Design a protein around this nucleic acid. Structure first.
Ligand SMILES: COC(=O)C[C@@](O)(CCC(C)(C)O)C(=O)O[C@@H]1C(OC)=C[C@]23CCCN2CCc2cc4c(cc2[C@H]13)OCO4
Ligand SMILES: [Mg+2]
Ligand SMILES: [Mg+2]
Ligand SMILES: [Mg+2]
Ligand SMILES: [Mg+2]
Ligand SMILES: [Mg+2]
Ligand SMILES: [Mg+2]
Ligand SMILES: [Mg+2]
Ligand SMILES: [Mg+2]
Ligand SMILES: [Mg+2]
Ligand SMILES: [Mg+2]
Ligand SMILES: [Mg+2]
Ligand SMILES: [Mg+2]
Ligand SMILES: [Mg+2]
Ligand SMILES: [Mg+2]
Ligand SMILES: [Mg+2]
Ligand SMILES: [Mg+2]
Ligand SMILES: [Mg+2]
Ligand SMILES: [Mg+2]
Ligand SMILES: [Mg+2]
Ligand SMILES: [Mg+2]
Ligand SMILES: [Mg+2]
Ligand SMILES: [Mg+2]
Ligand SMILES: [Mg+2]
Ligand SMILES: [Mg+2]
Ligand SMILES: [Mg+2]
Ligand SMILES: [Mg+2]
Ligand SMILES: [Mg+2]
Ligand SMILES: [Mg+2]
Ligand SMILES: [Mg+2]
Ligand SMILES: [Mg+2]
Ligand SMILES: [Mg+2]
Ligand SMILES: [Mg+2]
Ligand SMILES: [Mg+2]
Ligand SMILES: [Mg+2]
Ligand SMILES: [Mg+2]
Ligand SMILES: [Mg+2]
Ligand SMILES: [Mg+2]
Ligand SMILES: [Mg+2]
Ligand SMILES: [Mg+2]
Ligand SMILES: [Mg+2]
Ligand SMILES: [Mg+2]
Ligand SMILES: [Mg+2]
Ligand SMILES: [Mg+2]
Ligand SMILES: [Mg+2]
Ligand SMILES: [Mg+2]
Ligand SMILES: [Mg+2]
Ligand SMILES: [Mg+2]
Ligand SMILES: [Mg+2]
Ligand SMILES: [Mg+2]
Ligand SMILES: [Mg+2]
Ligand SMILES: [Mg+2]
Ligand SMILES: [Mg+2]
Ligand SMILES: [Mg+2]
Ligand SMILES: [Mg+2]
Ligand SMILES: [Zn+2]
Lengths: 49, 103, 50
RNA sequence: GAGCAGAGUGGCGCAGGAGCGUGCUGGGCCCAUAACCCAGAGGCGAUGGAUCGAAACCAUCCUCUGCUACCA
RNA sequence: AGCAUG
RNA sequence: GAGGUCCGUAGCGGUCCUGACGUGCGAAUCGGUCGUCCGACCUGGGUAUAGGGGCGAAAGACUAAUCGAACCAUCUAGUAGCUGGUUCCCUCCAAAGUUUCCCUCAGGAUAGCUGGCGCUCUCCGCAGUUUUAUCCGGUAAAGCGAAUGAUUAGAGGUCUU
RNA sequence: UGCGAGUGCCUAGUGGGCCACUUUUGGUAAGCAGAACUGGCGCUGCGGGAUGAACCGAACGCCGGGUUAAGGCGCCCGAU
RNA sequence: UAAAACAAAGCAUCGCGAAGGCCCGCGGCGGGUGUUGACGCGAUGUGAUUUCUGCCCAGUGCUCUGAAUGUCAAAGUGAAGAAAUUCAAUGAAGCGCGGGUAAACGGCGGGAGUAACUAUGACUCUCUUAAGGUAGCCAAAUGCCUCGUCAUCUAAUUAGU
RNA sequence: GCGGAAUCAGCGGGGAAAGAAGACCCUGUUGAGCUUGACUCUAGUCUGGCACGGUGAAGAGACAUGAUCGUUUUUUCACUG
RNA sequence: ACAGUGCCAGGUGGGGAGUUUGACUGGGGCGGUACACCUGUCAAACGGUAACGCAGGUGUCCUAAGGCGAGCUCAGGGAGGACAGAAACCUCCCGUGGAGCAGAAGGGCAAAAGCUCGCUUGAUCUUGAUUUUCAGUACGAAUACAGACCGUGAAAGCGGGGCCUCACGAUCCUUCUGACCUUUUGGGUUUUAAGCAGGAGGUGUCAGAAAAGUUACCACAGGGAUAACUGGCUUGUGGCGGCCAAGCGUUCAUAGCGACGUCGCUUUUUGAUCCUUCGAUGUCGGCUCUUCCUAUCAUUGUGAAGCAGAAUUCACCAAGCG
């Protein structure tokens, strides 16, 4: 998504390839906005069970 | 500023100077059945979003202070609305400042 | 903006499953009197790749 | 150039009716030193004004540090 | 409980 | 005799010469030189996806020489404080770029400057002028042995420190 | 001293200005920027400044004669 | 503009046990994934292999629990009033309140003194933050000063190493 | 200062040469693409209320100084149409 | 008998829609407010008068710092008196204001407009007229009256805010106050609502829209009213050259130099301005090629040296050739 243009993905655009906004989003997001990690309870490298 | 709680001043109904209790006027609670309010409600009802302007660019920090004067005569009970110049601080019946004393 | 690809996948134009060479639905047999009370047997004829 | 912030015990800092921890001095403990204990001393960048009275408030100077200074 | 050095 | 293996035909593509041409053979072609060439390969036909939609190994790329929102008709003679144009003669009069207000500074409203039509009178009134009286002013000049603010140099006194 | 005055309607264009003698603010200065008074150019041709928007003279119906303004009178070129 | 861009295998997160996850649709017992079932479907980041992957949950996100003061709409309840009406109690989600999470977006200091010639300063004191840039790497396609300083390459090099 | 018909082959000084109502800059109370902590809305989605929408049995209640009987609010369990 | 559906209610909702994103300005941006006001000056002795001209101030404060009356005189200095002093308190003398009057500045003021006391609420109710900006419109502010009711003083008088010049705000909507007020519509009563008159809730872009960015993917109408490149005026800065003569040059101002001062030229630097050019005059360098200038490096001819020779400096005619 970061490799696209802002017209066609909420992640594209910018003079650097960066997301520019948190990837985690609420489950109650409209279609078009619901991209990335969906309603993540936890994120990062799992360390344990 | 400081204003005493009793003022001897003209009473329109009696036609002569009488004593008056002095208090501060506060704006009353808005009615739901004022003609303008119910016109506004009927215009808001529906689709179209907000219709009348909302004021945002406030500029004045101070409001004019308005004194409510109650005639003390037992059967007169007249009231007048009396405004004075605007000031940041206000009080009723403060202590009478006295000069020539240590501070 | 435009409709995004994950939003286009639900219209089923070019995102439908390629199912011409699939051999069928993999389903157990329908329940019946014999299966509910006793049993029946079958011979395993083929083992194929779909 | 224009904007902002900061000048105070030897050195780092707090803060309208001059202090903190460290440093220093003197005496304790110790064979002695550091550690520890008991005390003491040391001073609001400059100028003018408001206020009864200011390190603090308001202006002007002397230093210092940061943010800018685009577009052809 | 804490006890470094010559 | 394996390999998204190498050189290299056909095919597919399009590097460099920034070569040719550049009112061209051509609204993208030509030559030499190039990349790949058993694979994520090339290709006909059929078929599906249609405009704020499609499709995109992602360049805002392609969607009939049209794409950072196709094309056709209509609403529509859309709006323009902004450019350009605005058709015969003669006679008489003849300016303004200034005041106040406006999301006002390429624009208006308003006063001023103009013209036209008159009317009421005349054959006392007025004046971008002087004179005679009468007031008003604080600029040029001057002053600092006069106030305020500066500022140079010598004198004479004293116990005033 | 000079001169006929008063008064009412309707009204277009204009609301980018510029220059010069004296006064004058900013700026080193400017064919710079900003004001005061008067006159010009814009809206204006004509004689002179060789040439020129605003300089000097003078303002304009079509002509004949005469005379002047400012500026000129070696030749171009009218006039020592 | 053929590239350093995109893709890629690999790595790592996230949601979902079907009345479900993601998505389409004006609408229906509508439809795609789905002839599918976690070794799967869907959503993101990084980019083979080798070696590593430091600290921060203060901010902004996401997420788990609902009983303390809280707030909190419509409907319903009660009371007063002649009635419209007003008042009161009650009180969902969501915000606040309390945990977690950085292979989520992101972030990762300054000032003084000191070693027996100077120079550095391992060491000390101090103000401070959520944490104060760890392992590595460089005038790099990232360094203004800058044509940095040394060495090498040359007769001489703002170039290269 | 000077200048003499009509021409041919070259040439790139000049015509402030040609093409296109400057694409840079500014103005317009002209737009569009995109973004968000701009303003005003909105699809979707989460939650509450009323209707579809029934049958019982218990618990906690308001009722018609203890209990009973029959009116209703709610919690739980069970039933099916 | 809950999923679910129908209809309401609250939350979330750049997924999507519509729209806005001031002005002035030595181009625009950033900065600033010269956008509403006040004092001195500019400002040219009536009044008026500009620039992002100069020096400043304002969005307040005051139950008294408003109103009367009475009684006093201030800043400062001199001379004295236990502690006491540079500076506490007392006394006398001089003292035109050199003090104070809320604040910026200007004006004004001495048995007061200053200081201290006494009594008070003219900072109240009402209709007109006038001045200031001005269009002779509004607001704000102010001035003379007039009619009530009061304060104060023995009284004449003075007072409807602050000694004067600033300190503030329309339509619509809401809110309070006032009348034995009018309407609330076929008639009557009572709530309610609407009127009329006076205050308040505010628009600081202050005669008063409700409002964030980016475009190097861009478009349109125009603009030389307006920048970037060239040309024009100017020459601060840059470059070059003079005049004077403290000193240097072991002596010696001037062979060669030349401080402190001062006068110019040039348009090969940069600025300053915005006159031409936005229905287009092709932007830096390098290559190639021509010509011109002199402010002369070398070459020809000369003059001076702190010129013995050699080499080297200063200057003159001189751009022919490098
Ligand atoms: C086909 O059109 C052209 O030639 C191209 C063009 O638009 C390109 C614009 C730009 C230069 C900014 O790229 C242009 O050249 O601009 C203008 C031009 O047009 C012909 C002539 C002008 C006008 C007077 C002399 N000068 C010559 C060049 C020039 C150079 C500039 C500059 C402005 C100009 C202008 O500003 C920075 O340097
Ligand atoms: Mg891209
Ligand atoms: Mg988007
Ligand atoms: Mg960032
Ligand atoms: Mg509604
Ligand atoms: Mg191969
Ligand atoms: Mg090959
Ligand atoms: Mg190519
Ligand atoms: Mg070519
Ligand atoms: Mg050709
Ligand atoms: Mg569709
Ligand atoms: Mg492809
Ligand atoms: Mg469009
Ligand atoms: Mg206009
Ligand atoms: Mg307005
Ligand atoms: Mg025009
Ligand atoms: Mg004067
Ligand atoms: Mg004078
Ligand atoms: Mg001028
Ligand atoms: Mg004209
Ligand atoms: Mg005329
Ligand atoms: Mg004329
Ligand atoms: Mg001449
Ligand atoms: Mg004649
Ligand atoms: Mg002549
Ligand atoms: Mg990641
Ligand atoms: Mg990390
Ligand atoms: Mg957190
Ligand atoms: Mg390091
Ligand atoms: Mg080389
Ligand atoms: Mg290197
Ligand atoms: Mg040519
Ligand atoms: Mg144009
Ligand atoms: Mg155009
Ligand atoms: Mg405008
Ligand atoms: Mg728009
Ligand atoms: Mg918002
Ligand atoms: Mg949204
Ligand atoms: Mg939008
Ligand atoms: Mg503007
Ligand atoms: Mg005058
Ligand atoms: Mg008196
Ligand atoms: Mg009276
Ligand atoms: Mg007074
Ligand atoms: Mg209105
Ligand atoms: Mg770009
Ligand atoms: Mg792009
Ligand atoms: Mg111009
Ligand atoms: Mg130029
Ligand atoms: Mg010079
Ligand atoms: Mg000598
Ligand atoms: Mg001009
Ligand atoms: Mg040309
Ligand atoms: Mg051309
Ligand atoms: Mg010469
Ligand atoms: Zn009364």
């Amino acid at each position: 998504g970061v490799a696209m243009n802002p017209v066609e993905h909420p992640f594209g655009g910018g003079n650097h390839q960066h997301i520019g906004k948190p990837s985690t989003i609420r489950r109650d997001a409209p279609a078009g906005r619901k991209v990335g990690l969906i309603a993540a309870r936890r994120t990062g490298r799992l360390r344990g069970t | 500023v400081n204003v005493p709680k009793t003022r001897r001043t003209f009473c329109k109904k009696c036609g002569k100077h009488q004593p008056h209790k002095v208090t501060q006027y506060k704006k009353g609670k808005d009615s739901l059945y004022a003609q303008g309010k119910r016109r506004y409600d009927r215009k808001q009802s529906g689709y179209g979003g907000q219709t009348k302007p909302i004021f945002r660019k406030k500029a004045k920090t101070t409001k004019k202070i308005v004194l409510r004067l109650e005639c003390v005569e037992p059967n007169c009970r007249s009231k007048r609305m009396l405004a004075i110049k605007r000031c940041k601080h206000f009080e009723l019946g403060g202590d009478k400042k006295r000069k020539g004393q240590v501070i | 903006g435009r409709v995004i690809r994950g939003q286009r996948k639900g219209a089923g134009s070019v995102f439908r499953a390629h199912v011409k060479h699939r051999k069928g639905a993999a389903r157990l047999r329908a329940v019946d009197f014999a299966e509910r009370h006793g049993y029946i047997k079958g011979i395993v004829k083929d083992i194929i790749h779909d």
